[PDB]
Amino acid sequence: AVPFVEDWDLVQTLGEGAYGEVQLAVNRVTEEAVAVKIVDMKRAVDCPENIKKEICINKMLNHENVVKFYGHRREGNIQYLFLEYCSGGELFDRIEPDIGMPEPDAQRFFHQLMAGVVYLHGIGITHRDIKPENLLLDERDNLKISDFGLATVFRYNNRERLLNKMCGTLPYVAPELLKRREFHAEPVDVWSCGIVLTAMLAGELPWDQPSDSCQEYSDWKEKKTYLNPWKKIDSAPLALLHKILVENPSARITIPDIKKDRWYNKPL
Numbered sequence: 001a002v003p004f005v006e007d008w009d010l011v012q013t014l015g016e017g018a019y020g021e022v023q024l025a026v027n028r029v030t031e032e033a034v035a036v037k038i039v040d041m042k043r044a045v046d047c048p049e050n051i052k053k054e055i056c057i058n059k060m061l062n063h064e065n066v067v068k069f070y071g072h073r074r075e076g077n078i079q080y081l082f083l084e085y086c087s088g089g090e091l092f093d094r095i096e097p098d099i100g101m102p103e104p105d106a107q108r109f110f111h112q113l114m115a116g117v118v119y120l121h122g123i124g125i126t127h128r129d130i131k132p133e134n135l136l137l138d139e140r141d142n143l144k145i146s147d148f149g150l151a152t153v154f155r156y157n158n159r160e161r162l163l164n165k166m167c168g169t170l171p172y173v174a175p176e177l178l179k180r181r182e183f184h185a186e187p188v189d190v191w192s193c194g195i196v197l198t199a200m201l202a203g204e205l206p207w208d209q210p211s212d213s214c215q216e217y218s219d220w221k222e223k224k225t226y227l228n229p230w231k232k233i234d235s236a237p238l239a240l241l242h243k244i245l246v247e248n249p250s251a252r253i254t255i256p257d258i259k260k261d262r263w264y265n266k267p268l
């Protein structure tokens with residue numbers, strides 16, 4: 001990207017994406033900032049197809065709680081994706097370890113998270129890796145869903161399909177990914193949003209994984225909310241978490257009903 005880097009300072013690394021590292025690029029003349037995701041397609045034989053899909057999905061998106069996609073180009077074996085620079089950083093860094101953040105801040109972010117996910121689901125897209133590292137903040141602390149490297153289409157027009165791919169980040173994945181050969185897309189994203197809410201409120205992930213052998217998950221199934229992280233969480237948001245972190249995805253709360261939840265609507 002020699003002409004580009006003559007005019008744009010690749011100032012620093014912002015982070016890792018599913019398929020590559022993301023850099024802050026600043027135009028020397030205009031000082032416009034853009035995020036440049038740099039993907040080495042030689043790292044996997046299926047990387048070209050995979051990054052092509054991320055690009056394709058990105059072209060479908062336009063929402064205030066989704067990271068803007070500006071464009072892309074290839075040079076040799078490297079794919080460059082040009083994305084909104086979200087100057088508020090990752091939601092992850094608003095979460096004080098073992099403490100979380102103030103409840104009003106968690107609620108606001110959660111509302112914005114719901115808005116983004118509703119939008120994605122409405123266009124038939126599931127993100128599949130919702131976590132604080134993939135939720136960015138703009139200059140006014142508006143939440144933006146980031147990184148569609150693991151995203152896929154679960155509804156073609158008005159026809160849903162079941163998914164089967166075990167992907168995502170283990171502490172955030174729904175138990176059906178470890179239990180059912182096929183499953184519905186939307187409840188998996190709802191579950192990860194519940195784990196994000198948990199992390200925001202208590203600064204602590206509740207379990208390594210929602211599997212039968214994970215004691216911390218068994219403790220939750222057994223309603224032991226007198227243990228961490230749950231004992232740090234007020235009963236109101238905890239009541240919502242009780243509805244989101246339901247093992248049977250068919251019994252799990254849907255987003256329309258999350259919007260009816262008492263804590264969701266609570267003036268703080």
Ligand SMILES: O=c1[nH]nc2cc(CO)c3ccc(-c4ccc[nH]4)cc3n12
Pocket residue numbers: 014015016017022035067083084085086087088089090133134136146
């Ligand atoms: O601005 C962006 N666009 N895409 C991304 C992707 C990541 C990786 O999570 C990313 C990570 C961090 C930051 C940031 C940190 C501080 C201010 N901003 C921006 C990011 N970022």
